[model samples]
Target chain A: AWEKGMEAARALMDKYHVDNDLKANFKLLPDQVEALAAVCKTWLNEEHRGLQLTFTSNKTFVTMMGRFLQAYLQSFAEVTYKHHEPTGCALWLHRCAEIEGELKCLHGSIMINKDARCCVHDAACPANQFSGKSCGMFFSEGAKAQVAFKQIKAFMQALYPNAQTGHGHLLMPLRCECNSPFLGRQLPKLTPFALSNAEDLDKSVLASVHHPALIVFQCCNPPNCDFKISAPDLLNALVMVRSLWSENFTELPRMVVPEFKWSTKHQYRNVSLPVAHSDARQNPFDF
Target chain B: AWEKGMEAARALMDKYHVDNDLKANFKLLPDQVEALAAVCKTWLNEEHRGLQLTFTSNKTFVTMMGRFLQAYLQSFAEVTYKHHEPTGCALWLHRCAEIEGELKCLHGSIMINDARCCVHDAFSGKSCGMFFSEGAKAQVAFKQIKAFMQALYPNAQTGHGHLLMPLRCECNSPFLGRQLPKLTPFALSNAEDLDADLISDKSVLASVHHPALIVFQCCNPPNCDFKISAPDLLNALVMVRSLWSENFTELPRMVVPEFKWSTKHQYRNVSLPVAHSDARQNPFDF
Candidate 1:
């Protein structure tokens, strides 16, 4: 697998799983990773943030799974121990999974939503008049070809209404690659030190979730040691983050620059067109 | 626990026990569906993302373990099924857990090239990294945990890493509740669906790293269940997600916007300062 994609994707997968039980995932082989990286860079240059990871080899595929597993276990442990808010893990996983396709390829929420795929804030359909309830997955069908996998389709099926048909009439189909990224492979063995206690079943249960095998990205002391995660250390080093430590997410790094204190306009404002209700992308015009 | 997270974590716990040959196991709680939903929502939105589930109660903590069990199990399925790449599953799991605070986190690629947490691409740290190298908690504590448990019952220790820790981490001082969301009053057993595969031989020596649950999240029924995921989906979605989804993440979404077609200059020239890097507040510079 492309090490970068695997690593980036793994970071996201683990975050979501731990906080929200989300399996948002990604993968890309060396060449595919390179291609994806190029696409991401170009996309980013265009102010588009859609990120994609493509897998081409068995190694890449396996590596991707390994990374994801490690992330999930970590999240599980966090939730079990109650150290951070579930949302903390949720935020990381949601953003990491968003890095799957060319930037700006699709709606940008997939990359940023901390929980499951983002949904329209409105309960109603995009048309606004259909089914006055909260509407979700307005573009579920479109996610298929974009990711080239069956999982997105499945997600649409389980979460969206009549997902097999279309989102209120959008004709989208699953068109990508023949290979499926959600498959099993040989798992990394657990370090001897990370094993669970037979007598303390609860501790054993906790260990299984945060298994040593799951901590690959943060290992130290070689052969078999505990990986130091020192987030407090990292946070303490940053001056700007002192006040922003856990205050506002907008203060953090983002693809579409956030509304800084100096900005006169809100970042969430419409960029393609002025917010005139009469405009084409708006209500009256489309209506 | 999030609905999907609760689902996956539960399965992982049992899967680990089965894989490692450990006799200990968690109980299935399929009945607490609604409590799980509320916890899931709270964990997903306000606690994890920027949005809040709004209905969390004090009882949520009681039901969290079951949710974790389910969440773990689902993630285990993803790795074992080969649905996504093994490393892909690893990435997903890592992202999920790392942010939870129960676990440490890692960055990918060149940035981590010189970092201490960076491990080789083997995806296995059994004998590589200092953490899992030798006499580590996983290697050392796990054996102790097993021996203690097994001493009570000779067959308790399965010997293999998968069977012993199943998911493979020692619970002795293991991270829990540190990264996961808090339980709300909504976390009653009667409100959620925390079922376990009770029929199967609970002591089977299986790999806890299956991706079956991960696949189910992506492909299962219920139309538009974007909740279930693998590393790929998480990567693509987070790159451009919104605050409504979750708020703890933004780098990818900020890096990739909806109108990327027009923001070429912005994308090339813009670079958000890394979190905790060169900043006085976050001095460790993670």
Candidate 2:
């Protein structure tokens, strides 16, 4: 069906209940045609990925149920934590609701680990003891507010134990915003997975666990989003809490610069760090 | 066969390449028999779900390929971030791997959203600004360390813009190590009017954290995305749940709370913990 790209074409007809019509004015939108063609020819050929389509009319928008969703985050009003008895800690997270504030602001994970977040002299408490188990929200109203979100992980790493690692390939290359001399970088990539063997249930093989290397980030500072003073305060407090761990965590660790070798013939590039040191305003030890 | 629950049984003989002996002595394990019978009569008859079986010998433990697996976690070595232009920020996360140290620790999301992540006079800089869009790790090693993992999500909700809300319910059962999130109360929409059970029952449970069964390969983590037909999934849930709530101990093998008699097994107005982790937990507690 094509000039060059060939072999096979699999049609995934996700049949929709189009109670309305193409029997009426039957013209696809202008931009829609361009996108349809590009996808039909290029990505469909090069990358083994297919696209989806739906049919709808103006009147149909008023009422619909159980529509298809690409992805939806699962959360609750006030999620409680599982407080393991003995010396274990409880953990959970919640999201904000309302019109003006935007629905994305997660209040972040709140754990009353230890007696009122007090400093303790136990390895298990800091290592795997209490519940520092929740991974919090990622927010940025933009410029100045970036300070609040910057070094959360690095500092948290000091406060917590270690970051899990697994089989990861260099996912993709990212370029800096300069547009002139670009700053290029690569991200270790991973897809979330289930470990059990689904095919042959009788086979006693255990489900293999897969932890893909990953990096996720986003940026949009516009009229709609805003950051309160407490945003920055959260970062500062993370530093304060981490230092209670040891004198070393008080000092910022050297940045883990990324480097990669594409193959035997491909040239190697030693990616530079955005900043020599991890994101921090004043020295932690200075406090 | 006149009434219900009488589909003649079919055998799935995955006659393995058994390179061992059955002539030595013929007998099955004790608990295996009980578990097998519970599954054979009750689940197969009542619910629209089927089961599988295979024959294996001890000598074959040395090797095999493409074994069946229920689930797996997707991760890697060192993960970097994605930085955008004009007023966009870069984002990424990482995990630790070692013997002495627990491998579940994720250093969290590190971002350089602005000029060294500085505080500036621009609204775009923070509202939707910087690179905080990246959701980081859920870390809890247990005991005293639960301190770190416990409050991360709540704090993150505060730092980030929003935690997405979906149709969730309460009274969910645990799938992996963690308890599942509940589903939202089923609101009767116009579409559901046509076939009340279509949108009302099955579909909710399938997408509502279809965890009890691990067929949906939704999280492959980085590409945590999926799309499906509503009516398609709903009908499936009704059948699956009824099958799950079956009482296999009886001779006739009947299901719980007959369809209209008792809504115990129904999807709507139910108060049971539903599997909420779109992606189930890893072998290690996160």
Count steric clashes of candidate 2. 129
Q: A1-287 in candidate 1: lDDT tens per residue? A: 23533554444334323223222223332212322222223323343233222212323322232322232333333212222111111111112123464212122333212122223433332431212121112222233223322222223233454445432121111111211111111111111122233224333223233322111112211123222221111111122122222232223221111111211111111111000001111110000
DockQ for model 2? 0.01
Residue B231's lDDT within candidate 2 is: 22
What TM-score does each of the candidates earn? 0.14, 0.16
Candidate 2 residue-wise lDDT, A1-287, digit = tens:
12111111111111121212321221222111222222223323343234221121111111010000000000111111232111011111112211223322112322222222211222134432221211122222222122212222222333333545311211111111111000111111101122233233311111111111112221111111121111112222223222321222223322121333322111111211010111111211100
Model 2 misplaced regions, further than 4 Å: A1-287, B1-255, B258-286
lDDT of 2 by residue, B1-286 (tens): 2112211111110112111232112122111122222332333344322221111111111100000000000001111123211101011111221122222211122223312211321222111112121112111111111121122222222212111111111122022211111111122111111322322233222222211111111112112222211121222222222332332222222111111112122222223477666575575675
Per TM-score, the best of the predicted structures is: 2
Give the distance in Å from residue A37's predicted Cα in candidate 1 to where it truly belongs: 81
Estimate every model's Cα lDDT from 0 to 1: 0.23, 0.19
Candidate 1 deviant stretches above 4 angstroms:
A1-287, B1-64, B68-139, B156-286
